[PDB]
A paper describes a structure:
Sulfurtransferases, also known as rhodaneses, facilitate the transfer of sulfur from a donor molecule to a thiophilic acceptor. FrST exists as a dimer and can be classified as a TST rather than an MST according to sequence-based clustering and enzyme activity. Each subunit of FrST comprised 11 α-helices, two 310 helices, and six β-strands and was divided into two distinct domains: the N-terminal rhodanese fold domain (non-active domain) and the C-terminal rhodanese fold domain (active domain). The active site of FrST was composed of Trp102, Val176, Arg177, Glu181, Trp211, Arg248, and Arg252, which surrounded catalytic Cys247.
Within the crystal, each asymmetric unit contained two subunits, designated A and B. After refinement, the final protein model of FrST exhibited a crystallographic R-factor of 23% and a free R-factor of 26%. The model comprised 302 residues and 339 water molecules. However, the remaining residues were successfully traced based on the electron density, except for a loop of Thr188–Glu194 (later termed as 8α-η2 loop region) in subunit B, indicating the high flexibility of this loop region. During the crystal structure determination, we also solved another crystal structure of FrST, which belongs to the I21 space group and is annotated as FrSTI21. The overall structure of both structures is almost identical, evidenced by an RMSD of 0.284 Å (Cα). However, when FrSTI21 could closely resemble FrSTP1, a distinct conformational difference was observed in the 8α-η2 loop region at the top of the active site. In subunit A of FrSTP1, the 8α-η2 loop region (residues Ala186–Ala198) adopted an open conformation, as supported by clear electron density in the corresponding map. Glu195 formed hydrogen bonds with Arg248 and Arg252 from the active site loop, while Tyr192 interacted with neighboring Arg252 through a cation-π interaction. Volume analysis using ParKVFinder 3.0 revealed that the volume of the active site in FrSTP1was 8.2 Å3, whereas it was 12.3 Å3 in FrSTI21. The diverse amino acid composition and structural flexibility, as evidenced by weak electron density in the 8α-η2 loop region, suggests that this region is likely involved in an open and closed mechanism that facilitates substrate recognition and selectivity.
Numbering used by the authors:
A (entry chain A): 2 to 300
B (entry chain B): 2 to 187, 195 to 300
């Protein structure tokens, strides 16, 4: 069994059991019941050096249905975690590049499958590296485990296009850049498969670029800073059913994490379809400019 | 009134009233009640030379909602046709580049607004030029007419995503390239493949070398023999966008006379980026899953 990180820094958050410090992790490496998972946008980083004993999840190959636009099923999840020495009761700590952007995404997927003890290493690769902590290129050399086949739950933390169309009048957070938000750009040149034939945002969406929730050192900002950003800045109130979206669900998972686990909103869903779906969908309401715009009637 | 082209070639088709020959148009140009409309994928061709008296429709600016992914509404359509001197009773002959690929699309849009008498110039720009017939580079000075505001009808010849999800068990025609249908290409999406159970009939197979629609015999082999379509079949066609599947809609509705033909305009650009819609790969149709 694997204890919580009692660090004072985390106790102000709604779900302090969802974070650990680099100092805590350095002291727990190799402990029975703990698996450390690297999850990056840039999958090649793991091979340049990883936290010792860490395994890797590759978002290109491991987490998507290979044919359909959907995440893997319970059978594919069970085989992925078993190969990595992960059992149902294992404490998983996930860390990654770009201030745990893809780390939160892996945690979201684990949560679709109802894995209870899943935590982020606050600050990811960047704080581990700034502190001069060790990486290896040694394999985890992992003994296989049996993980149960569970049915994926898309009810609680996931939204589809019809839930979004139905959601108008309820808070909507767009986590893309202001240029994307207004309709000046759609994608990156590195990801042309993440553009769309229309530019803009979902009408009544508040723009909160996801990176605003991360400090320079890549740690999650304080409760006071987050409260400023989402409650004062974006108008969120207790009891609010919140939907977050980006270009794809991978990139709005960090904001879901922030709202579900740090600010403690009960009802937070990631609209994974995001702008790639919305901007290519026939007859969905789109607005342009830096104005959120008026909520239309629920469709 | 504007006479039907009695040409034997067209009389074997289900709706011979939907086609005119270059010979007919040359003999009927400038006749009262006839407006000729150029509709091209390459909109700049019009200024290089156009049939005398012909007006232009520009798919970049004239036919799409500027904000939403949708076609214009009745008020926009009335304004467009009014400006071009088209009345509700006007006979409209549409022609253009790429074997009337986009002419078929314009006719589709006119039919959404229920314009009765719309015809294609069999063989379009390519057969007019090949025959050495006259072009002007004059824009054709036009007196505006009043066109009525009618509600666009999306029911009869248009299909939405949820119509296609509900369609499995009934025929789908995918009009994209073999290398798009297999999922070794993709106006792309992030996913590659085709809709399971869809028969690949690349849209150009229905056109002859000279740009004209193939004989009823040749179409029957393509769509009945090749793709297994039977009388009373409810058919949906799709491409990457609805603009590019309108030609095959035209073939099935007007030439083979299928009663129920719908253009799924969302096409692969929507399908290939929709969350959790069925997709299969390789040159095989695949089997129909249960209607969703």
């Amino acid at each position: 069994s694997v204890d919580l990180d009692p660090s004072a820094r985390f106790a102000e958050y709604a779900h302090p059991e969802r974070l650990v410090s680099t100092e805590w992790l350095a002291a727990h490496l190799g402990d029975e019941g703990l698996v450390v998972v690297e999850s990056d946008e840039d999958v090649l980083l793991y091979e340049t050096g990883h936290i010792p004993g860490a395994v890797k999840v590759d978002w290109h190959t491991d987490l998507n249905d290979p044919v359909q636009r959907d995440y893997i099923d319970g059978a594919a999840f069970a085989a992925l975690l078993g190969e990595r020495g992960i059992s149902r009761d294992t404490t998983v700590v996930i860390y990654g590049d770009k201030n745990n952007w893809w780390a939160a995404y892996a945690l979201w997927v684990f949560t679709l499958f109802g894995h209870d003890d899943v935590r982020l290493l606050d600050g990811g690769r960047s704080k581990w590296e700034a502190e001069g902590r060790a990486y290896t290129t040694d394999a985890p050399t992992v003994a296989a485990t049996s993980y149960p086949v569970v049915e994926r739950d898309d009810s609680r933390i996931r939204a589809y296009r019809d839930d979004v169309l139905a959601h108008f009048g309820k808070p909507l957070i767009d986590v893309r850049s202001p240029e994307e938000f207004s309709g000046a750009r759609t994608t990156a040149p590195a990801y042309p498969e993440e553009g769309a034939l229309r530019a803009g945002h979902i009408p009544s969406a508040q723009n909160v670029p996801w990176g605003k929730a991360a400090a320079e050192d890549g740690t999650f900002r304080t409760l006071a800073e987050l409260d400023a950003l989402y409650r004062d800045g974006a108008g969120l109130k207790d009891g609010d059913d919140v939907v977050a979206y980006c270009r794809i669900g991978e990139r709005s998972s960090h904001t879901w994490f922030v709202l579900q686990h740090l600010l403690g909103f009960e009802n937070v869903r990631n609209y994974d379809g995001s702008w790639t779906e919305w901007g290519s969908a026939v007859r969905v309401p789109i607005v342009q400019g830096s104005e959120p715009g008026e909520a239309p009637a629920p469709i």
